Amino acid sequence: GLSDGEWQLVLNVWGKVEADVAGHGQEVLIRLFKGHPETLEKFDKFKHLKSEDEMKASEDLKKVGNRVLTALGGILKKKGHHEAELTPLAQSHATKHKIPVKYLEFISEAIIQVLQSKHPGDFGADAQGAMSKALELFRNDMAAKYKELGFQG
Ligand code: HEM
Numbered sequence: 001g002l003s004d005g006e007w008q009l010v011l012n013v014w015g016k017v018e019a020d021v022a023g024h025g026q027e028v029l030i031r032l033f034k035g036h037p038e039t040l041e042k043f044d045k046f047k048h049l050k051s052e053d054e055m056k057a058s059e060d061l062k063k064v065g066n067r068v069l070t071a072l073g074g075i076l077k078k079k080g081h082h083e084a085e086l087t088p089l090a091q092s093h094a095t096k097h098k099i100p101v102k103y104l105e106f107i108s109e110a111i112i113q114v115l116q117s118k119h120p121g122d123f124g125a126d127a128q129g130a131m132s133k134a135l136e137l138f139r140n141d142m143a144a145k146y147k148e149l150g151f152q153g
Pocket residue numbers: 039040042043044045064067068069071072088089092093097099103104107
């Protein structure tokens with residue numbers, strides 16, 4: 001759905017994230033929890049945290065942040081051929097976590113906001129476009145495996 005040029009702009013900015021996956025991960029989560037507080041409710045381990053300072057101090061949030069961006073970089077580096085990587089993820093998010101597709105949308109946004117903020121020189125207009133389409137592709141594939149797992153997304 002993305003051209004090669006677009007994969008290139010995606011892998012270029014991912015190279016900046018690769019240096020600090022956990023600190024990036026922790027920042028995406030705080031942005032999501034602040035923007036859409038309803039999403040904090042899905043994480044048992046730290047749904048009690050009320051503020052940013054508490055959030056920044058949680059070792060658990062960081063670790064989870066880490067897991068989440070690690071898995072995502074892995075998908076992105078496949079350039080669209082990520083069936084094997086997405087299967088396990090659709091399976092736990094549709095059964096265990098029960099993450100609605102609107103929630104994958106909010107985190108997408110959150111992702112784009114952090115990149116914009118940290119790496120504007122590696123995230124111009126075209127890159128922003130490419131990243132949005134790559135995340136859309138990911139949500140569309142997630143949604144297709146959720147249907148099959150009988151999870152109304
Ligand atoms: C970019 C999209 C996401 C990716 C790539 C991702 C990836 C992961 C991975 C790899 C794990 C660990 C193993 C597993 O449980 O599958 C995980 C855990 C989890 N994810 Fe997702 N995730 C994403 C989005 C979300 C969103 C938006 C939510 C809720 C709003 C969510 C809720 C959870 C929860 C509740 C867990 C269990 C965490 C715990 O151990 O306490 N995820 N995620």
